[PDB]
Design a protein around this ligand. Structure first.
Ligand SMILES: Cc1ccc2nc(N)[nH]c(=O)c2c1Sc1ccncc1
Ligand SMILES: Cc1ccc2nc(N)[nH]c(=O)c2c1Sc1ccncc1
Ligand SMILES: O=c1ccn([C@H]2C[C@H](O)[C@@H](COP(=O)(O)O)O2)c(=O)[nH]1
Ligand SMILES: O=c1ccn([C@H]2C[C@H](O)[C@@H](COP(=O)(O)O)O2)c(=O)[nH]1
Lengths: 286, 288
């Protein structure tokens, strides 16, 4: 079972991790550098030891793809994961006093579709400015699948001062061999309790989507971690989760033929056979 | 638990055993695996591989060249370090449409992205003083003032500058980490020529970690090497089979011979490698 690599990482950190203070003031147990491999072949790695917020995964990805940097746009679909980092108080603490609530700055959506464009605000029109990395990845996969440069990068040093949160998913790399598409994510910072399960699902989903558009089979998702950490108030909750036996991963079916990445809608996806254990409350450190 | 040269030899064995055939840009052909990670301790030793002699002069000189912000291959070539000459040659540059550039102008690669990320590239000899983001000095400053930061990153991958690069960076980014007065480094290498590139590259980022540790008053911890497309070129199979027959020897030490306050002030004569006793050099063709 693929899920055993996630649970193995949690237990590796519980026992070898080092105490480390953090930006949030909460404290963490932390390890630097880990890697896990999840198969996408006839299965989809949505964790079963706790229910992962699939609606959030799907809507957050559609939002990235659209190029949005407005947390209220996501919040109005019922997904509140970016609300704390886009709030008035949070934005004021970084010194963005005149920024509208929900304006996260030039984060993923903007960097993926408009890398290098000049950010103004979340409502501006950026059509045709900057580099559309997402569409370039798709185009390269179709014409030169052997390419070792199929990368999408959200980390933009010049824009960091304007971001409410510098991207945790600094970059991802695609790989093709034998008509099978794989993806590796470099995650610089991983909240192992709250974020990583959700982050795994997102990139697996992105890989299914791209595979669908390019006529390829999904292969592997490789998850690479920089600072992999467990917040101190997640230790007891993760201990509960580790008592649970994984159930089989579900499958993902895409329900119509879709030609452009921008045409996918929430209704085109169906998770089949997902039957997780209950959610576990893990407070978000902000 | 293996923390030295055996991880590297193990990756080689794994690609020879389970690697898939994959064609590549250079027309040589490879055996390839996607996604690998190894961890090299830097604690009282320096990971210069011993089953073949690694080109230490080239490692050192290339790192000093990156640090000073250069993207001119002639500056290495002038020192007898030829590792960038095929990608900086007149013919290679012209083959990519760069007929007006001077030979050796690799474009806005590491030196430029590390010291001036976001500046508008003109040519290799332009004055970029005060332009773009000095990522390297920022890394060093964050390490001194906020060692717990999970954002201590230097990124060479610049999508806007890609069309101008002779070769897009293989070392897309690196991340630093501090705990218990120890500095570690992780490298994301999108593409690793396991025979020729990877030993030399491990040594590069181990050396950068020692230099930064020295400037910040920290001890070197680990170097974590992460690979995207880890590949053995088909014409490196014979040389690698010879290498896998040889027993690893203890790693050397690295000594910094003087107290140096700024990263820019390091010179080649400040570094001494001690007790390096490798098996001979093995020649391996460079795929262009
Ligand atoms: C998107 C986001 C924004 C800020 C975050 N802050 C912390 N501390 N942890 C996080 O995982 C986190 C995340 S991912 C997340 C958050 C909530 N539910 C599932 C996944
Ligand atoms: C710097 C560089 C430039 C282009 C390259 N092309 C191939 N194919 N492999 C490589 O390792 C490579 C390298 S690293 C290298 C080259 C020669 N000696 C040791 C290390
Ligand atoms: O998709 C996401 C977004 C954020 N985080 C986490 C990691 C950190 O705990 C925190 C970000 O804080 P810094 O690393 O930037 O300090 O949120 C994730 O795990 N996944
Ligand atoms: O420091 C370096 C520079 C280049 N290469 C390799 C990897 C590839 O074999 C080749 C670059 O080719 P592409 O991945 O860009 O196609 O050189 C390395 O391994 N290390």
């Amino acid at each position: 079972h693929g899920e055993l690599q996630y649970l193995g990482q949690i237990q590796h950190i519980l026992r070898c991790g080092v105490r480390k203070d953090d930006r949030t003031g909460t404290g963490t147990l932390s390890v630097f550098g880990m890697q896990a491999r999840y198969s996408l072949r006839d299965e989809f790695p949505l964790l079963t030891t706790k229910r992962v917020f699939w609606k959030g995964v799907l809507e957050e990805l559609l939002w990235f793809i659209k190029g949005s940097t407005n947390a209220k746009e996501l919040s109005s679909k019922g997904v509140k994961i970016w609300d704390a980092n886009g709030s008035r108080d949070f934005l004021d603490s970084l010194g963005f006093s005149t920024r509208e609530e929900g304006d996260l700055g030039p984060v993923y959506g903007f960097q993926w579709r408009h890398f290098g464009a000049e950010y103004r605000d979340m409502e501006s029109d950026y059509s045709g400015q900057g580099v559309d990395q997402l569409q370039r990845v798709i185009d390269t996969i179709k014409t030169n699948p052997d390419d070792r440069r199929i990368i999408m990068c959200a980390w933009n040093p010049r824009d960091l001062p304007l971001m409410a949160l510098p991207p945790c998913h600094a970059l991802c790399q695609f790989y093709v061999v034998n008509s099978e598409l794989s993806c590796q994510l470099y995650q610089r910072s991983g909240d192992m309790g709250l974020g990583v399960p959700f982050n795994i699902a997102s990139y697996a989903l992105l890989t299914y989507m791209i595979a669908h558009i390019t006529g390829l089979k999904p292969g592997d998702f490789i998850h690479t971690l920089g600072d992999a950490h467990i917040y101190l108030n997640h230790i007891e909750p993760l201990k509960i989760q580790l008592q649970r036996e994984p159930r089989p991963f579900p499958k993902l079916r895409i329900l119509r033929k879709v030609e452009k990445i921008d045409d996918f809608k929430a209704e085109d996806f169906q998770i089949e056979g997902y039957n997780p254990h209950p959610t576990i409350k893990m407070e978000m450190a902000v």
